[PDB]
């Protein structure tokens, strides 16, 4: 009947509970059968049956409000979400997606498709500010959980909601993609701090696809071309290799077929 569901709450959130969540998500996003340079590859979009296409991440807070997010298992990205009797979807880029998302939350009373997409550029201009000016951590997650919930009742406005998306995507999608960003959130969560992300986190987000390509295109682990990146102090450094990334990126989109038996 329903796609797989992962449960998480911000109530009593520890570093432990957060990490065992993000791990459980990763468990559902990939089998782990496709692993290249030690890194799990996301299932290939082409030929993928609609019934394996999405996963469900349910989020609740101390107020006991809950929302369920839909993640595409091919890009590990949020395509929409449900709160109570209403379901909301980001504007599809093509016919094929538009079809796919009709297999989600089919029992919901009301179904809305946004006139806008869920890409960062779009969300930033709606919420009124950049990812860098938007804070993260257990507290900003609790508020976003609520704002998404009360949107269906008219309680939430657009910029506030947009910002709420930016937060959850990063804390969940981005967190699942990168063990590094998972660590950045662990930090925040552990001490109950809240802070906007640094240039390193942001650039990693912008670079996910390209890294995925280079890695699967690599020659015995060596890139054909480097990818620019920033550390926390916003200074650039170039990545010519794989072994650097293994501690960083947890999942990869599917660029091409796996490698030969050798390595």
């Amino acid at each position, epitope marked *: 009947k329903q796609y797989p569901i992962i449960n998480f709450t911000t109530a009593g959130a520890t570093v432990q509970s957060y990490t065992n969540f993000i791990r459980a998500v990763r468990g559902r996003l990939t089998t782990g059968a496709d692993v290249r340079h030690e890194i799990p590859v996301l299932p290939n979009r082409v030929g993928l049956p609609i019934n394996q296409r999405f996963i469900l991440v349910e989020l609740s807070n101390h107020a006991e409000l809950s929302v369920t997010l839909a993640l595409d298992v091919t890009n590990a990205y949020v395509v929409g979400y449900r709160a109570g009797n209403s379901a909301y979807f980001f*504007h599809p880029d093509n016919q094929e997606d538009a079809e796919a998302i009709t297999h989600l939350f089919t029992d*919901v*009373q*009301n*179904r*809305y498709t*946004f*006139a*806008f997409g869920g890409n960062y550029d779009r969300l930033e201009q709606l919420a009124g500010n950049l990812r860098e000016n938007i804070e993260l951590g257990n507290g900003p997650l609790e508020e976003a959980i609520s704002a998404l919930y009360y949107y269906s009742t008219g309680g939430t406005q657009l910029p506030t909601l947009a910002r709420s998306f930016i937060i959850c995507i990063q804390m969940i999608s981005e967190a699942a993609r990168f063990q590094y960003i998972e660590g950045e959130m662990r930090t925040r969560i552990r001490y109950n701090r809240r802070s906007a992300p640094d240039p390193s986190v942001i650039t990693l987000e912008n670079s996910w696809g390209r890294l995925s390509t280079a890695i699967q295109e690599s020659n015995q682990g060596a890139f054909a071309s480097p990818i620019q990146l920033q550390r926390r102090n916003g200074s650039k450094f170039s990545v010519y290799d794989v072994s650097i990334l293994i501690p960083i990126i947890a999942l990869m989109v599917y660029r091409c077929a796996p490698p030969p038996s050798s390595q």
Partner: nanobody, 129 residues
Framework: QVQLVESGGGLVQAGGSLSLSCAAS????????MAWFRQAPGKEREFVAS????????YYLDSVKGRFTISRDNAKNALYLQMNNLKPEDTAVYYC??????????????????????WGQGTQVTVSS
């Protein structure tokens, strides 16, 4: 600034035909969900037809089902309502309504006047005999 203007209204006889047009401007039309409603005096405002942002998914009030056809030209920034076998019941002021927030609205919400932020001035449809 978003604009909604309906034309094509008038008077016809039971069985007669009409072609309705809404001229929309401003905003991004090609990404906006759209519908037609109607209201007769003394009567509550009733849903008529809805159409998503792409060419096709569409819903009708069953009284009008098969008699009426809603369409849109996203290049022309235009919405259309075709009314063919016309009845005295169909007499009412017809309004076009836009949602700039939503590309598509289905399920219960699709019939609710509340879910659409922009409305047109309206055009009168009277049917005789």
């Amino acid at each position: 600034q978003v604009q909604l203007v309906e034309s094509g209204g008038g008077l016809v006889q039971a069985g007669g035909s009409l072609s309705l047009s809404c001229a929309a401007s401003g905003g991004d039309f090609s990404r906006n969900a759209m519908a037609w409603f109607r209201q007769a005096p003394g009567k509550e405002r009733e849903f008529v037809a809805s159409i998503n942002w792409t060419g096709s998914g569409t819903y009708y009030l069953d009284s009008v089902k098969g008699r009426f056809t809603i369409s849109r030209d996203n290049a022309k920034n235009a919405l259309y309502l075709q009314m063919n076998n016309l009845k005295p019941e169909d007499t009412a002021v017809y309004y076009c309504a836009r949602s700039t927030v939503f590309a598509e609205i289905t399920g219960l919400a699709g019939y609710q006047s509340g879910s659409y932020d922009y409305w047109g001035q309206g055009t009168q449809v009277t049917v005789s005999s």
